[PDB]
Amino acid sequence: MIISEFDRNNPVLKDQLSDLLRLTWPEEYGDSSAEEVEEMMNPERIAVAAVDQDELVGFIGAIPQYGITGWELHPLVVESSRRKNQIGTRLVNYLEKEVASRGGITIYLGTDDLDHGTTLSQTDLYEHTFDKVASIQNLREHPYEFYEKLGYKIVGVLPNANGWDKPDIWMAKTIIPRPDS
């Protein structure tokens, strides 16, 4: 397989992406799936594909939310039969260089804990907020640990976002060398 920039003019790659998003997050992607993928094709954003044979085995994107300095990692999906084989790691690393070249300094993302897959859920997050964030533990293979192993740190939490004790975990990473103090 090869990871490279997404052919934004390939109708098949786009359909494959639409299918991948609908099979992974059907609650977020539905009938207007094609229109949502077209938004991911916007010139200002970055679109990186992981392709093997005739399949889109993975995809990653980033939106410039704060000028060209603050990018959001959205989305990131690997085919179910292709996970835990480093595609995600290679895709995130590829995105980081894409962002850096465009003047980006940091990439952030938000990953919710809806299935009680982290110790940050089912607990009053306003109580010892940051002591809890620090002592976090993965209970159900929650993707937060993935980003953590890639250098992203939990920089914030949104308590009770998806209902009682179901927070949104905010993670970020500065991709370029700090100009010192």
Ligand X SMILES: CC(=O)SCCNC(=O)CCNC(=O)[C@H](O)C(C)(C)COP(=O)(O)OP(=O)(O)OC[C@H]1O[C@@H](n2cnc3c(N)ncnc32)[C@H](O)[C@@H]1OP(=O)(O)O
Of 3 and 73, nearer to ligand X (C-beta) is: 73
Q: Which of residues 31-70 bind ligand X (CB under 6 A)?
A: none
Of 5 and 141, nearer to ligand X (C-beta) is: 141
Q: Does 77 bind ligand X (CB under 6 A)?
A: yes
Q: Does 118 bind ligand X (CB under 6 A)?
A: no
Strands (E), the chain: 2-5, 46-52, 55-66, 70-78, 106-112, 153-158, 168-174
Q: Does 24 bind ligand X (CB under 6 A)?
A: yes
Report in angstroms how near the CB of residue 179 gets to ligand X at its nearest. Answer: 28
How far is 118 from 113, CA to CA, in rounded Å? 7
Q: Which two tokens stand for residue 21?
A: 């998003």
The vertex-49 CA angle with 174 and 147, nearest 5°, equals 35
Question: Would the annotation count 48 as a binding residue?
Answer: no
Report in angstroms how near the CB of residue 181 gets to ligand X at its nearest. Answer: 31
How far does the chain reach from its first CA to its final CA, in angstroms? 42
**Which of 19, 55, 145, 168 lies at the binding interface for ligand X (CB under 6 A)?**
145
State the residues that interact with ligand X by CB under 6 A.
24, 73-78, 83-89, 109, 111, 138, 141-143, 145-146, 149
